[model samples]
Target: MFKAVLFDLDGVITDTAEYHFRAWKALAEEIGINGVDRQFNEQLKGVSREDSLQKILDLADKKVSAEEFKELAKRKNDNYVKMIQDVSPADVYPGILQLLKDLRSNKIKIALASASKNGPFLLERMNLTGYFDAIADPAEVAASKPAPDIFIAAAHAVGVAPSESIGLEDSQAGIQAIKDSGALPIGVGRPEDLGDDIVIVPDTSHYTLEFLKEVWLQ
Candidate 1:
């Protein structure tokens, strides 16, 4: 049996990606960067705030002083925090709560490997804090998704080898990170969105212990 299941919080557990995009878009426009669209927002998934800001700056060919960069990141986070204040249990994606319960019943560990610095906050807001055995602190990781740091850290936190866990994610970077960390990756989106080679489900509603076990057998 898989020792643990690692989860990505944004698009996998909830729909806060929209809030993140809105916050980032607002900040980008305020800083005179135009055309911050959803397509561009996709690039920010599973990325750290500082990296996301750097990408935005690269797009606009704009640079900021170190102090200004910190201030802008704080502003964006403040907006995101205010926007997600109303998130409750109802906001959790369909089928995720049941999936978490099933994992618990089966004695499998659960850890969050999200890039969100607010992972704990969002989990508490959604009444999901008790479900996770560990939440990898993004700030503590040396690198973001696609580098495998957070996923590896999360697996270690749960006392599971990365190879003994399965990671569920909804972004390309996240899937890559899971794979790079030596965990089985279950992509949570369309084939077009997540690429065709990896195993994928349409959304969280399709996740099941049975399905995960089946995938693990492969």
Candidate 2:
């Protein structure tokens, strides 16, 4: 049985990637950088802000001074935050609140494993900070997704072993992180749609307590 559940912040919870895409899109256009093209989504999915920015710079061969980068990052974060201002626990995925209630009733811990430092902020924006035992974001991790650091750290915070934990991710990098850390990975969206996460699901609607029981609890 799973002892803990870890989740990625953006697509998994609030569909917050639009803000990211927009921010990067804005920055790229403003700087005459073309990294925000078609493949940008695939290249940057589930990646940390710093890493994402670096990738964008690499693709466009553009560089930002410290102040400029800070400004751009802040712009993106603020924009994302504004978009989620109306979000709350009520907007959580179809069965998630029920799922969390069920898990907590079973004495299982929940954690948020975000590769970006902004994870906590997003949680706050969505009024979801109270649901998890811990928040392990890039600010606290040694590295970002595709690395096992964040998952491992979240597990430690939840006082569980990776083998006993279940991780929810929407990116290939996130799935690889869980795989490397020895956790069971639940992909949150279609594999083809994201190309970031290894597993596939139509959406959270496909993940029900009955479904998990059928596959994991039994």
Candidate 3:
């Protein structure tokens, strides 16, 4: 059995990615960055705040002053945080909370390895902070997903070696990070969506207690 489980907050734990998309799209539109859409938001998944902004800039092939970039990032985060204020435990993806509870009951450590800076606050907002033993701080990491820094940090936080823990993600970048961290990568979406390099769960909503219990038993 794995000693710990590292979770990615956006698609894995909650559905805040829509709020993030809204905030990002709004920022892009306000800045006159053309062609910002849901497809653009896909590139933001598993990416750090600063990195996401840089990608938005690249999307428009536009550049902003350092101060302007900082301001824009803060503005986007403020908007996203406001949008997520209404998130409660009900906002958690179906079956994920129960799985968290099951993991705790089994004495398995849980940690958050998300790239989002708001992960901790979002967890508190959802009243789900108790489920995670540790949350990797975005500010503490040098690089984001596809770099493995955050996953490694999370593994250390939960007192588990990378090879002894499992990382669940819904994006290709995150899967790459998990693999690079030396953890087993469990994909949470369709194989077509996240590729076939890892185990795919198809959907979190279908991952009931029975499914998780069977997973641990194996």
Candidate 4:
């Protein structure tokens, strides 16, 4: 009984989280931090860039003001943006287009909720902007992932309660966000972590457009 489909932008829809990790890694290295690891990506998943950057700084034991954190975060995004420019239609995970089309065909409203403020730009570049009915961006919200605000915003924009919306995610933060929003979440890659979602597919090879109806629509 899902009336709307809300998607998270990074690891779930697009495979760009690794690039973000690399960018963050580079930024940390430049600051003389040697043990920077992207393993924190999991913990920071679904969170805002600001929050993630702050987490990194805190983890690295860097006590800095908001302005200093901004400088570092900006430097990291400079690299991330460059990596994203290479993204196009081919870079989109398999089955995503088919799933979106199937969802649209059913006349279900679709929305995107992303911590990345640049998510719309990426969608436009990838020719996916028109597929969604609305987008909830961290730049427009009070809080990001692990907080219910972003998903709450998306559901509201689509004129539905969170209970009537189905959220798709690939990160723990997103899972928590969807749960906090009082919605059923489908985890893309981590099926075991999904708990009763029934669809654990990832990388596009595990499902088809037809599978969406047989499984997701059920």
Top of the candidates by lDDT: 1
- Tens-digit lDDT track of model 1 for 1-218: 79999999999899998789889999999999986898787788888899899999999899999999999999999999999999999999999999999999999999999999898999999999999999999889878877999999999999999999999998888998998999999998779778989899987888999899889887
What lDDT tens digits, residue by residue, belong to model 2 across residues 22-125? 77787767778865864567667788877877787788687779998888777776766676667676666677667777877888899988876667766776
Q: Model 4, 70-161: lDDT tens per residue?
A: 88888888879988997898877877888788778888788998888779889987899889999986787766778889999999999999
* lDDT of residue 201 for candidate 2: 76
- What candidate 1 gets wrong by more than 4 Å, as runs, is none
Model 1 clash tally, residue pairs: 0
Candidates sorted by TM-score, best first: 1, 3, 4, 2
Count clashing pairs, candidate 3. 0
* Collision pairs in model 4: 94-204
Question: Which of the predicted structures, 2 or 3, would earn the higher lDDT when compared with the native?
Answer: 3
Indicate whether candidate 3 or candidate 4 has the larger lDDT: 3
Question: By summed lDDT, which 10 consecutive residues of candidate 2 come out lowest?
Answer: 191-200
Q: What's the lDDT of the predicted structure labeled candidate 4?
A: 0.78
Query: Could you give candidate 3's per-residue lDDT for residues 186-213 as a string of tens digits?
Result: 7787686678765689778755546544
Deviation in Å, model 3, residue 137 alpha carbon: 1.1
User: Which is the winner by lDDT between candidate 1 and candidate 2?
Assistant: 1
Candidate 4: count of backbone clashes, pairs at least 3 residues apart or interchain: 1
Order of the predicted models by lDDT, top scorer first: 1, 3, 4, 2
